[PDB]
Structures are given as C-alpha cells and as structure tokens.
Design a protein around this motif. Structure first.
Motif, PDB file in Angstrom:
ATOM      1  N   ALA A  90      82.505 118.827   5.027  1.00 19.10           N
ATOM      2  CA  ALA A  90      82.402 120.160   4.459  1.00 19.10           C
ATOM      3  C   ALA A  90      82.045 121.144   5.560  1.00 19.10           C
ATOM      4  O   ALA A  90      81.189 120.858   6.400  1.00 19.10           O
ATOM      5  N   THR A  91      82.695 122.307   5.539  1.00 17.34           N
ATOM      6  CA  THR A  91      82.499 123.360   6.524  1.00 17.34           C
ATOM      7  C   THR A  91      82.147 124.657   5.824  1.00 17.34           C
ATOM      8  O   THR A  91      82.914 125.134   4.974  1.00 17.34           O
ATOM      9  N   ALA A  92      81.018 125.244   6.229  1.00 21.02           N
ATOM     10  CA  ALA A  92      80.437 126.394   5.556  1.00 21.02           C
ATOM     11  C   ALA A  92      80.128 127.540   6.513  1.00 21.02           C
ATOM     12  O   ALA A  92      80.455 127.478   7.702  1.00 21.02           O
ATOM     13  N   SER A  93      79.479 128.587   5.993  1.00 22.41           N
ATOM     14  CA  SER A  93      79.180 129.810   6.732  1.00 22.41           C
ATOM     15  C   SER A  93      77.938 129.722   7.603  1.00 22.41           C
ATOM     16  O   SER A  93      77.774 130.564   8.490  1.00 22.41           O
ATOM     17  N   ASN A  94      77.055 128.761   7.365  1.00 21.11           N
ATOM     18  CA  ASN A  94      75.897 128.582   8.227  1.00 21.11           C
ATOM     19  C   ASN A  94      76.199 127.684   9.411  1.00 21.11           C
ATOM     20  O   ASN A  94      75.485 127.737  10.418  1.00 21.11           O
ATOM     21  N   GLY A  95      77.242 126.877   9.309  1.00 17.22           N
ATOM     22  CA  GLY A  95      77.516 125.853  10.277  1.00 17.22           C
ATOM     23  C   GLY A  95      77.191 124.458   9.823  1.00 17.22           C
ATOM     24  O   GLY A  95      77.128 123.554  10.661  1.00 17.22           O
ATOM     25  N   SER A  96      76.979 124.251   8.533  1.00 20.06           N
ATOM     26  CA  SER A  96      76.630 122.931   8.023  1.00 20.06           C
ATOM     27  C   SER A  96      77.898 122.099   7.970  1.00 20.06           C
ATOM     28  O   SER A  96      78.580 122.026   6.950  1.00 20.06           O
ATOM     29  N   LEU A  97      78.235 121.470   9.093  1.00 22.23           N
ATOM     30  CA  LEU A  97      79.363 120.544   9.147  1.00 22.23           C
ATOM     31  C   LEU A  97      78.915 119.227   8.536  1.00 22.23           C
ATOM     32  O   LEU A  97      78.610 118.251   9.223  1.00 22.23           O
ATOM     33  N   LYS A  98      78.892 119.195   7.218  1.00 17.98           N
ATOM     34  CA  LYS A  98      78.278 118.072   6.535  1.00 17.98           C
ATOM     35  C   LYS A  98      79.240 116.897   6.477  1.00 17.98           C
ATOM     36  O   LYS A  98      80.386 117.035   6.040  1.00 17.98           O
ATOM     37  N   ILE A  99      78.760 115.747   6.938  1.00 20.07           N
ATOM     38  CA  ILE A  99      79.550 114.533   7.087  1.00 20.07           C
ATOM     39  C   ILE A  99      79.213 113.629   5.913  1.00 20.07           C
ATOM     40  O   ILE A  99      78.070 113.190   5.766  1.00 20.07           O
ATOM     41  N   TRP A 100      80.204 113.332   5.085  1.00 22.09           N
ATOM     42  CA  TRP A 100      79.991 112.688   3.803  1.00 22.09           C
ATOM     43  C   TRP A 100      80.718 111.355   3.742  1.00 22.09           C
ATOM     44  O   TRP A 100      81.592 111.057   4.556  1.00 22.09           O
ATOM     45  N   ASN A 101      80.371 110.572   2.725  1.00 26.73           N
ATOM     46  CA  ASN A 101      81.164 109.424   2.323  1.00 26.73           C
ATOM     47  C   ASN A 101      81.219 109.393   0.806  1.00 26.73           C
ATOM     48  O   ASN A 101      80.273 109.789   0.125  1.00 26.73           O
ATOM     49  N   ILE A 102      82.341 108.898   0.272  1.00 33.40           N
ATOM     50  CA  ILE A 102      82.537 108.877  -1.177  1.00 33.40           C
ATOM     51  C   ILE A 102      81.755 107.793  -1.894  1.00 33.40           C
ATOM     52  O   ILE A 102      81.929 107.632  -3.107  1.00 33.40           O
ATOM     53  N   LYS A 103      80.914 107.029  -1.204  1.00 29.50           N
ATOM     54  CA  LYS A 103      80.212 105.947  -1.871  1.00 29.50           C
ATOM     55  C   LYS A 103      78.707 106.141  -1.957  1.00 29.50           C
ATOM     56  O   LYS A 103      78.083 105.577  -2.860  1.00 29.50           O
ATOM     57  N   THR A 104      78.108 106.914  -1.053  1.00 25.61           N
ATOM     58  CA  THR A 104      76.685 107.227  -1.129  1.00 25.61           C
ATOM     59  C   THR A 104      76.383 108.716  -1.131  1.00 25.61           C
ATOM     60  O   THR A 104      75.271 109.096  -1.520  1.00 25.61           O
ATOM     61  N   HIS A 105      77.309 109.557  -0.671  1.00 27.01           N
ATOM     62  CA  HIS A 105      77.357 111.006  -0.856  1.00 27.01           C
ATOM     63  C   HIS A 105      76.204 111.746  -0.195  1.00 27.01           C
ATOM     64  O   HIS A 105      75.987 112.927  -0.489  1.00 27.01           O
ATOM     65  N   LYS A 106      75.462 111.099   0.692  1.00 32.73           N
ATOM     66  CA  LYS A 106      74.464 111.791   1.483  1.00 32.73           C
ATOM     67  C   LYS A 106      75.143 112.378   2.708  1.00 32.73           C
ATOM     68  O   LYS A 106      76.021 111.750   3.307  1.00 32.73           O
ATOM     69  N   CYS A 107      74.761 113.598   3.053  1.00 36.29           N
ATOM     70  CA  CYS A 107      75.336 114.255   4.218  1.00 36.29           C
ATOM     71  C   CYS A 107      74.778 113.596   5.469  1.00 36.29           C
ATOM     72  O   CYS A 107      73.575 113.669   5.732  1.00 36.29           O
ATOM     73  N   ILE A 108      75.653 112.935   6.227  1.00 36.96           N
ATOM     74  CA  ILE A 108      75.191 112.054   7.294  1.00 36.96           C
ATOM     75  C   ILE A 108      74.666 112.865   8.469  1.00 36.96           C
ATOM     76  O   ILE A 108      73.478 112.806   8.802  1.00 36.96           O
ATOM     77  N   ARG A 109      75.528 113.657   9.095  1.00 37.27           N
ATOM     78  CA  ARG A 109      75.156 114.372  10.310  1.00 37.27           C
ATOM     79  C   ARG A 109      75.218 115.868  10.040  1.00 37.27           C
ATOM     80  O   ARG A 109      76.221 116.527  10.316  1.00 37.27           O
ATOM     81  N   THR A 110      74.129 116.406   9.514  1.00 35.36           N
ATOM     82  CA  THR A 110      74.013 117.836   9.300  1.00 35.36           C
ATOM     83  C   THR A 110      73.582 118.511  10.591  1.00 35.36           C
ATOM     84  O   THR A 110      72.595 118.107  11.208  1.00 35.36           O
ATOM     85  N   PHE A 111      74.318 119.536  11.003  1.00 41.70           N
ATOM     86  CA  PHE A 111      73.878 120.366  12.112  1.00 41.70           C
ATOM     87  C   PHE A 111      74.276 121.802  11.818  1.00 41.70           C
ATOM     88  O   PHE A 111      74.647 122.146  10.694  1.00 41.70           O
ATOM     89  N   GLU A 112      74.176 122.651  12.832  1.00 35.18           N
ATOM     90  CA  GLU A 112      74.254 124.089  12.643  1.00 35.18           C
ATOM     91  C   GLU A 112      75.106 124.676  13.751  1.00 35.18           C
ATOM     92  O   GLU A 112      74.785 124.511  14.931  1.00 35.18           O
ATOM     93  N   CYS A 113      76.191 125.347  13.380  1.00 36.35           N
ATOM     94  CA  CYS A 113      77.056 125.965  14.373  1.00 36.35           C
ATOM     95  C   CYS A 113      77.179 127.467  14.189  1.00 36.35           C
ATOM     96  O   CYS A 113      77.008 128.221  15.154  1.00 36.35           O
ATOM     97  N   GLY A 114      77.457 127.929  12.990  1.00 31.89           N
ATOM     98  CA  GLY A 114      77.605 129.353  12.795  1.00 31.89           C
ATOM     99  C   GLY A 114      78.611 129.634  11.694  1.00 31.89           C
ATOM    100  O   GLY A 114      78.800 128.821  10.793  1.00 31.89           O
ATOM    101  N   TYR A 115      79.246 130.801  11.781  1.00 37.26           N
ATOM    102  CA  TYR A 115      80.158 131.225  10.725  1.00 37.26           C
ATOM    103  C   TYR A 115      81.479 130.496  10.935  1.00 37.26           C
ATOM    104  O   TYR A 115      82.440 131.020  11.501  1.00 37.26           O
ATOM    105  N   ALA A 116      81.527 129.261  10.466  1.00 36.01           N
ATOM    106  CA  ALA A 116      82.714 128.442  10.625  1.00 36.01           C
ATOM    107  C   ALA A 116      83.586 128.534   9.384  1.00 36.01           C
ATOM    108  O   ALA A 116      83.085 128.666   8.266  1.00 36.01           O
ATOM    109  N   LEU A 117      84.901 128.455   9.586  1.00 31.13           N
ATOM    110  CA  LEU A 117      85.814 128.663   8.470  1.00 31.13           C
ATOM    111  C   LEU A 117      86.867 127.567   8.334  1.00 31.13           C
ATOM    112  O   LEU A 117      87.271 127.244   7.213  1.00 31.13           O
ATOM    113  N   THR A 118      87.307 126.974   9.442  1.00 30.13           N
ATOM    114  CA  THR A 118      88.344 125.952   9.415  1.00 30.13           C
ATOM    115  C   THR A 118      88.069 124.899  10.478  1.00 30.13           C
ATOM    116  O   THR A 118      87.405 125.153  11.488  1.00 30.13           O
TER     117      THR A 118
END
Lengths: 360, 72, 279
Positions: free
Chosen positions: C14-42
């Motif tokens: 998932a890519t958002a406006s804060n920079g939360s490039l959230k790394i997921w899996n469909i079996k446990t759904h916890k965001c694995i590697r949350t970090f912060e980049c900025g106003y990301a769009l694609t």
C-alpha cells in the motif's frame, strides 16, 4: 498442335492475347510440380470473368486442372457484376480488362466487389492515374475507374466500377523519343477505418524526403467514412509524376500493414518512385506491358517508343517472347545516337487489327 | 545484338540479360529500402530530367508513311 | 492509499500520502516493513520481490526494500515538477517514468542504485505510462487528450491517437500484445485495436469518472474501477459487464491484479483495501 504454352507465367497476358488475336491457345503444366497443382481459384474466376465478358469463347479444363484449352469468341463486353475471390484483389482482374476493354460491342460498365488492393498487385488509384493517362495517350477518350466503395486487405468488401465508353476503332500509333520533362509530382493518400492523423504522418514524411527539389509537389488526402470504409482498417499511399506538356506519368504505391509506420511508408514510396523515375524512360516500367500491347495492336505501320537499358529485363523478355509466339511480331531495337543515356527506341509495326463488333 | 538475343529460343531470360550486360506479380522490382534511401539522400542526379482540315489530315498520314519508310 | 503493488501470491503493498509503504501478506495482514517517505502516489515492485520502486509528487524518485534498512537510493530533482507514474519493463531492468514537466525519462538498475540514460520531451504534461508485458511497445497518456504509443528498441512514435474529450488517466496493454485499453475521466473506456489503432468499443460505465483500469493478464478480460465505489470486470470479446462489484464506500483510487490467476486487490479513499478472488 496449334499454340502450346508452359506454366502460369504471364498467364493473364497469354489469355488476353489469345482473345485479342482470335487464335486458340492451350496452356499446360500450371505448376504441375506442386502439392496443390493446377489452376488456382483466382485464375479460374478470372477465366469465367473472360467468359462473362466475351461470347462464344469455350474453356475446357483437364481433370488434373493444370491444362487449359481456350478457343476465343468475340469480345461483346457489356455491363455485368463480378464478385472477386478474396485470394486476390480487384487489380489483378481489372488490369487485363483495361486493354481488353475498348474494342467490344457495348460500353464497359462492370463493377468489382471484393478486396481493393494488396502489396504484390495493383492499386485502384494506381491504375487510375498511372494507366488511364497512358490509355488517353494511346487513343481512348472516355475511361474511368469509379471507386464507389473502398475495401481492405484482409476482409475487403469494396466496390469499384470500371467504365470505359470510348469504343475506339484501333489504338493510334505512338511516337515518343524524348524523355519527358516532369512538371508535377502529385499523389493521394487513402485511409479506411483508422485515425486521420495517419495520413498526415504519411504525407509530411514523404514530402519531407521529396521537399529538397524544385518540382511542384502536391499530395492530397482522403479518409473514407461511413460504409465506404470497407470492413477492415487499412491505408495506402500512391504518388505519380505527371508531365503535362504531353501527358505522361510514372507512379509508385504501397499499402501499410500491422506495424507499418506512416513516416517510413511515405519514405518507401518516395524512394520507390525515384527508383522508377530514374530507371524508366518515357513510360513506366509497370506501364510497359500495356504500352507494348497497344503499340502492337496499333495500325499497320511502325510506332516508336523510348526505353532505357534498364527496362530490358526478364519480364520484358517473356513479354516479347509471348507476343512473338502469339502473333509473331519482331520488335526492332534501335539505339539512340547520344550514348550518354543508353536508350533503345522500340519500333513495332502494329498488326492491322480493327474492332469487329461494332453496330454500324 | 539484343534483338536476336531476345528472339533466340534456347536461352533463359536472366541468362540473356547476364549475357548482354512471373508477371502475375504486377509490381515492378525494387532494391533494399534503406539502400536506395541512403543513395538518394541527395537526388540531384535526376535534375537532368527534372525542371485547312483536309490538308492537315493528309499531312498527318503522309508524314506517318514517310517516317514509316525512313525507319524501314 | 494511492497505489497498490502485488507480487505473485505472497506479498502486497500500500502506498499513501505520508509515505507508509506498507508491506502486507494475505495470510496475517500485519504491515511488515512500515517506513516513511513522503507524498507518494505510484509505485511498483522488482520482480523477485523484496525491492520497491516508488515515485512522489515532489521532484524525487525513491527505492526501498524488504529485508535490510529501508532507504537505499533516492534521486532528488529527477524531474523538476511532479511525476505521476512509473513502470518496470517486461524483465525488470529498465525504469520508465513520466512527469508533468512534459518529460518521460528512463533509468537503469545498476550495481544497488539507478542510472539515468535517456530523456524524451513531449508537447504536453504527460500523466500516465504503461509498458507492454513483452516489451513490444510503451504507451503514454497526455492531458492534451491523447495516447501516444512508442516502440522500445527505437522509440520511433508508432501511433498517436485521440478521442476521449478529457485527459485519459489510465492505460493498459493486453497480455499477448494485441489490444490496448484507454480510460478517461468521461466515464467511457475504449478498447483499442493495435495494428493501426482502430477503436472497437467506446463503452461507458462508472457514472462519475474512471480512476484506474487494469488487465486480468491470463485471458483478455479486464477490471475497471470507478470514482463512485464500484469496480466492474468486463470480457474482451462481447464487451458486456460480466460482473459489477459495489462493495466500497468512496473513491476507489487504485487496484492491481495478481498474475497467478487474476487475483485482484482494490483500494479506496475510505482507507480500506480488500481482496477479490475466485468463487
């Protein structure tokens, strides 16, 4: 026992010379060494076009289908329809009718439905002003190819209307010794079922390559909207060099296909036209069989036409051998005096033929 | 030369033209597109090419017969 | 969440406006590697996983990972205006992106970092880019409402096309390189033939605006989201809406299919992403 031929090489010319000269012909071994040997569907439909446009001409085919015996009747002509099969476009059917036509009983008003044009064969605008002005120079007055519905390469559905209405007695004899001073370089670009900007991307590239010259360049554009667009997308480009001071023409054409960039296709037809206009003298290389057949069915006198040393190749050799087996006319090949351009003057004494099917 | 070269029955046409120097396919012959485009990047070799009634009819047919005899 | 990436079957993004490039899996759904980049769009993956390329509305272009420390490489002022979207090629070595300084530029992955090689100027603010899954051709979407298709061995301007009467904002290309799908903000997608550019069906749905269209990459069928909380998928032979799906509540910004069987994940304005799978 009378007139025997081998192979389907220059086959349209063999049958059209048989029915002009009125001599019976017999052609065998039409690709006899083949898994599908014999007469193909386009040439069988061509032969039944000949049977629809003439009268009394009987055609028999062997059970092998590779041997055709043809008696000729008289050329009645007239008005009829003809669906052409999708193996071959309308150009391959119309270009022998274009010099079988003007001698018949009635006017030629015959409409062809099918594929308009393809790569190896003749386009409709290509034959229109690359071969109707040479017919106007050889003597006919009223000839037209009314393109009333374009077609397409893979599905076609187009409609042309060949109508000639100048029943000439015989073609007048020809006298061309000068290389024609090319006055104008014109052309058209046609598009079917595509975006119109493809035409501009053709024309700007083609006239970009030909824009370094003093000659007046003029290429026109046409899209075809509605049901005049055929049934598949396709687009082509043709260019003629028109010399107005006596009315001669050279031309080159091509149709794009899957992945054909319009800029490079315009460059390809521009360079092909320059190949033709540097390689050809006083007549187009593709206009050459019509030219020599009208000069050989001219009046009982000699007619002289300039060609260069490039024009003499294997198509011209098999043409002259065909006419020498059909009505045994030697073509005399004089050289022009100025050897800066090694040009032959072909002088041909025309067989004294008149059209013998006119209500007078 | 080239007249008897054509009308001699024995030799093939391409052997005839190589001694001198398939028409259902209508299209004239052609070379490599890139080759002749690169040759004709400049096209000034082609610059040498580029830039009463009864006595009238009698003069027409008699001049026809005269040029017929003069090349006969 | 502005954008979604997805691997074969395991990891998702998932890519958002804060920079939360959230790394997921469909079996446990916890965001694995949350970090912060900025106003990301694609954004996009790298094809083995574990490495994530991502743009921003600022002048930058950044690259992150999964296992090690988050930020590896960033190129600031890679485009001096905003960039909109980016793509790997069919193999995963080049990196094309387009940007509203009227520029589309390439990059090459080299060894850890990137390397710019070629810029291309256009006569308009480019805002979308899509490259074929066999590197046959790329397509770019320009707000002077046109779609331009270039090749990849030459980039020799294969097809300029138009007809949408608003800036087209999402492109896709067929899985076997035969048919493209252009989609604008006038609720009318267009399935487009390829050899010359003939339109086939200029069909109409999603009654406010198409926000993203994407291609089920097994057959030639395709999903299209909306701006009004409806995602449909269509078949590319009879062009009928073979399924509607109404189960979001706001502007469905993005969606992405998964290449195992067409296993799709969609993402909306209401902070919800969800998973659609087979019956």
């Amino acid at each position: 026992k009378y007139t025997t031929f081998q192979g389907s090489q220059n086959f349209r010319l063999r049958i059209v010379l048989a029915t002009l000269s009125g001599k019976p012909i017999k052609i065998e071994k039409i690709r006899s060494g083949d898994l599908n040997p014999g007469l193909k569907d386009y040439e069988v439909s061509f032969l039944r076009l000949i049977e629809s446009v003439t009268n009394g001409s009987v055609i028999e085919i062997s059970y092998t289908g590779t041997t055709v015996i043809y008696r000729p009747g008289i050329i009645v002509g007239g008005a009829s329809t003809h669906i052409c099969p999708s193996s071959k476009p309308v150009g391959y059917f119309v270009e022998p009718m274009l010099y079988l036509a003007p001698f018949s009983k009635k006017k030629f008003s015959i409409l062809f439905k099918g594929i308009t044009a393809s790569h190896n064969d003749a386009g409709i605008e290509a034959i229109k002003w690359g071969l109707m002005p040479v017919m106007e120079k050889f003597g006919v007055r009223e000839c037209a190819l009314h393109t009333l519905k374009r077609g397409s390469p893979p599905l076609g559905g187009g409609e042309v209307h060949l109508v000639v209405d100048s029943l000439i007695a015989q073609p007048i004899t020809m006298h061309e010794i000068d290389r024609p001073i090319i006055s104008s370089i014109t052309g058209v670009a046609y598009s079917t079922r595509v975006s119109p900007s493809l035409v501009n991307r053709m024309i700007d590239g083609a006239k970009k390559v030909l824009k370094n010259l003093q000659c007046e360049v003029n290429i026109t554009a046409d899209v075809w909207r509605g049901e005049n667009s055929g049934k598949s997308p396709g687009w082509g480009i043709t260019l003629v060099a028109q010399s107005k001071q006596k009315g001669w023409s050279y031309f080159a054409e091509d149709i794009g296909d899957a992945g054909s960039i319009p800029e490079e296709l315009g460059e390809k037809v521009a360079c092909q036209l320059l190949e033709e206009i540097s390689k050809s003298a006083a007549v187009g290389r593709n206009q050459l069989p019509l030219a020599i057949v009208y000069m050989v069915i001219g009046k009982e006198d000699i007619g002289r036409l300039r060609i260069n040393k490039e024009q003499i190749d294997e198509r011209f050799i098999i043409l002259l051998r065909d006419i020498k087996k059909i009505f045994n006319t030697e073509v005399f090949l004089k050289p022009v005096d100025e050897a800066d351009n090694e040009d032959m003057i072909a002088t041909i004494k025309g067989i004294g033929f008149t059209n013998t099917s006119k209500k007078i | 030369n080239i007249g008897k070269l054509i009308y001699m029955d024995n030799i093939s046409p391409e052997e005839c033209i190589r001694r001198w120097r398939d028409l259902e396919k209508f299209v004239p012959y052609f070379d490599t597109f890139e080759k002749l485009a690169k040759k004709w990047k400049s096209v000034d070799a082609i610059k040498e090419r580029f830039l009463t009634w009864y006595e009238l009819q009698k003069a027409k047919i008699s001049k026809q017969l005269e040029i017929n005899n003069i090349e006969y | 969440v502005r954008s979604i990436d997805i691997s074969d079957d395991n990891k998702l993004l998932a890519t958002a406006s804060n920079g939360s490039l959230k790394i997921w899996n469909i079996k446990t759904h916890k965001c694995i590697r949350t970090f912060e980049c900025g106003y990301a769009l694609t954004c996009k993956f790298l094809p083995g996983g574990l490495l994530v390329i991502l743009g921003t509305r600022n002048g930058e272009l950044q690259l992150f990972d999964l296992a090690s420390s988050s930020l590896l490489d960033t190129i600031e002022d890679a485009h001096d205006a905003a960039i909109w979207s980016l793509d790997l090629t069919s193999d995963g070595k080049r990196l094309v992106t387009g940007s509203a300084d009227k520029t589309v530029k390439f990059w090459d992955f080299k060894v850890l970092k990137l390397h710019h090689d070629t810029t291309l100027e256009l006569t308009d603010d480019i805002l979308c880019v899509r490259v074929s899954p066999d590197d046959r051709y790329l397509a770019i979407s320009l707000l002077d409402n046109t779609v331009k298709v270039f090749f990849l061995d030459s980039m020799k301007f294969y097809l300029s096309l138009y007809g949408h009467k608003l800036p087209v904002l999402s492109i896709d290309i067929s899985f076997d390189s035969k048919m493209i799908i252009t989609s604008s903000a006038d609720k009318n997608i267009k399935i487009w033939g390829l050899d010359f550019g003939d339109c086939h069906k200029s069909l109409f749905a999603h009654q406010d605006s198409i926000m993203n269209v994407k291609f089920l990459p097994q057959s030639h069928n395709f999903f299209s989201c909306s701006k009004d909380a409806v995602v449909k998928y269509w078949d590319g032979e009879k062009f009928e809406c073979i399924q509607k799906l109404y189960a979001h509540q706001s502007e469905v910004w993005a969606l992405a299919v998964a290449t195992d069987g067409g296993f799709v994940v969609s993402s909306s304005h209401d902070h919800s992403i969800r998973i659609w799978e087979e019956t």
